[PDB]
Write an enzyme that holds these catalytic residues in place. Structure first.
Site, short mmCIF file in Angstrom:
data_model
loop_
_atom_site.label_atom_id
_atom_site.label_comp_id
_atom_site.label_asym_id
_atom_site.label_seq_id
_atom_site.Cartn_x
_atom_site.Cartn_y
_atom_site.Cartn_z
N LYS A 1 -10.92 51.03 115.31
CA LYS A 1 -9.55 50.73 114.87
C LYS A 1 -9.41 49.38 114.20
CE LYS A 1 -6.73 53.56 117.93
NZ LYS A 1 -7.72 54.11 118.81
N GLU B 1 3.14 51.39 116.09
CA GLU B 1 3.34 52.13 117.31
C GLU B 1 1.99 52.27 117.99
OE1 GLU B 1 4.48 54.45 114.43
OE2 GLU B 1 2.39 54.98 114.09
N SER C 1 -17.37 55.73 118.56
CA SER C 1 -16.17 55.07 118.05
C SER C 1 -15.70 53.87 118.87
CB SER C 1 -15.03 56.09 117.89
OG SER C 1 -14.73 56.76 119.11
#
Ligand code: NA
Ligand code: NA
Lengths: 387, 383
Positions: free
Chosen positions: A82, A104, A371
């Site tokens: 991310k 969000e 990830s």
């Protein structure tokens, strides 16, 4: 804005201008020399790119099938992929002259990444979070506050991610002149699915170069977990035009696909519209998005990216599901066998790759996108698995 | 085997045979082509080396003095520098034909790194840990078990690292034939202090190269926190012969040096022979907000460095370290380990006095994810 029939900009008219301005700035800056210099600089020195590609020899030999390589996004600053998107969009926002970021978050993981990138670049950060998620992610909420971000609990509706998205959209209409809306996956109205994919494709470009160095050939299969779809698009995208390279996305099977407690939008959802995009969603009789479940906190996005719907339709990529139990076993297995504690999200990909490896021959190559790291999931695993 | 007077090999004949075999192994392998290949391969693909050197622009501009750079050991697999040492010794053990690793731990941080390394190479791992520390470090204990290691709580006597050391040493005497004892800092008898410093010196070699690349010159100051002293020696060691480079080790001031609750061995300790080495020891109960700074002893090479005045040694309090923890998070978006925050805190005070052409490198030895519960508890106690 379309990937076949999926995507679009299903938003009220007040958002069309701001999306246009964003699309305009991104078209300018994406190939701009100075922007890419600074982005690559932050990614190198602050984020720690490139991440290695690791051959899981013990795991490979234990299974006795194909070679399993792990793309180590777990080593990026913050512990998850991310960060790549958070830096790219935050820098874009700074180049557009914005002073503030909003986002969000459900699991809190994108919220943390956004708070990190905002702190780095000297920007105000406000994070909308469903009150139910706030309650369950107290350490992530604390992390965000340590990073200087303001967390705004959302008490309306179902007090979950869906409700946070609606608040974030409402904020952006009023504040877009100085605020950038930092979407955390390959979702939302155009151009977000494109931008996020572009900012994650560094994973796939590194992976391609790394595998060519290591084995002198492209992999047979690439396996990645799919929530909204960003880590999967990041590693998939540079291999899309390599026809021989198989692509497998792994969704959260939860308690089982027939149980009604999962998050497999592509597998069991239907076409619909939400968050400004035409894609696959798990929706009820009244057309409302229904609660998703997974042991992995980050596989809670309500829906899936339109580019994944498209890759499924044209059959370029295959999508499967792995259960909570299967993910948990992989989480333990990888930790013991390779000394790498994966994120529970990533464990879904590991779990499937292990099944797949067994079927394939020893000359063959599987790349798994790892990830994230599992430090964040230790509390969860202790409770469920026990001491 | 000495660093001036300090260091040495002060142990019974039971331990002499296995240490001697270790040196023959280390001398054989330290410079071996195959050992160095495999080590570098694991450090790259599994640990994620090299770590970057990061310029903390916002923090530098805010203080308004020296340029502050951070060597990002927080990005190494596991979130701490200890991994560098764990991989090195475990690989050596495999080369020596050992099938098992043992180690002691207080914070649990070295225990985790050993478990990770042991899991990597398919070795059995048993970690001896004091029972008082076991109860204080539930998540680290769980981590070790999740990684496949067995945690042996030591419930006898003091129930601290001191007792865990004793049990591990007893174990190695009996089992060295198939067991390697994996020490976690630049402490203990020869050849451990040298071996660990050797395995951490990669930090400094990267940092030297990276600072020349960034600024075209060596730094004016290098700041690192000091417990046992492994991360500081790792970054210090390649700059030891570059005379204009000031070296500063930062110890745990704790509640205060006057308060008597701290871990500043060099600043307030006394010379003694413990863990089979001559160095500074306080024994007394050491305290610090940062768990990894618990060791009451200190590496002998830091003893050697302090006496010749090559490095300077200072201390930072719990409160100052906490301030720097929060500051770095908010200003650079990097949450540091509380150990590392001691160094950041001192570097910040140091930067203010120095000029804008001047360069400081801070060794960011770890990330602060592991410390969030502690910091939450304290942060929630503020008025
Ligand atoms: Na989904
Ligand atoms: Na000490």
């Amino acid at each position: 804005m379309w990937f076949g029939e999926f995507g679009g900009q299903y938003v009220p008219e007040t958002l069309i201008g701001p999306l246009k301005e964003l699309e305009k700035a991104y078209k300018r800056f994406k190939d701009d020399e100075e922007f890419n210099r600074q982005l690559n600089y932050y990614l190198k020195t602050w984020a720690g790119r490139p991440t290695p590609l690791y051959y899981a020899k013990r795991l490979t030999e234990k299974i006795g099938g194909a070679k399993v390589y792990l793309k180590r996004e777990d080593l990026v600053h913050g512990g998850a992929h991310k960060t790549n998107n958070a830096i790219g969009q935050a820098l874009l926002a700074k180049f557009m002259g914005k002073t503030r970021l909003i986002a969000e978050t459900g699991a809190g993981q994108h919220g943390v990444a956004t708070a990190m990138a905002g702190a780095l670049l000297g920007m105000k950060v406000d994070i909308y979070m469903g009150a139910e998620d706030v309650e369950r992610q107290k350490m992530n909420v604390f992390r965000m506050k340590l990073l200087g971000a303001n967390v705004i609990p959302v008490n309306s509706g179902s007090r979950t991610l869906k409700d946070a998205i609606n608040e974030a959209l409402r904020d952006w209409v009023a504040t877009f002149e100085y605020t950038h809306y930092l979407i955390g996956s390959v979702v939302g109205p155009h151009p977000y699915p494109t931008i996020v994919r572009d900012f994650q494709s560094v994973i796939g470009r590194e992976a391609k170069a790394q595998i060519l160095e290591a084995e002198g050939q492209l992999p047979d299969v690439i396996v990645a977990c799919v929530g909204g779809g960003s880590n999967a698009m990041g590693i998939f995208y540079p291999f899309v035009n390599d026809k021989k390279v198989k692509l497998v996305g792994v969704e959260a099977g939860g308690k089982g696909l027939e149980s009604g407690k999962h998050s497999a939008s592509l597998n069991a959802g239907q076409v619909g519209v939400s968050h400004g995009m035409l894609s696959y969603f798990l929706q009820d009789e009244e057309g409302q998005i229904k609660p998703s479940h997974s042991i992995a906190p980050g596989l809670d996005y309500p829906g899936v990216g339109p580019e994944h719907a498209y890759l499924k339709k044209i059959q370029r990529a295959e999508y499967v599901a792995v259960t909570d139990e299967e993910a948990l076993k992989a989480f333990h297995e990888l930790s013991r066998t390779e000394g790498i504690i994966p994120a529970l999200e990533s464990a879904h990909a590991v779990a499937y790759a292990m099944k797949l490896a067994k079927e394939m021959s020893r000359d063959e190559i599987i790349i798994v996108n790892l990830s994230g790291r599992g430090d964040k999931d230790l509390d969860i695993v202790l409770k469920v698995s026990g001491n």
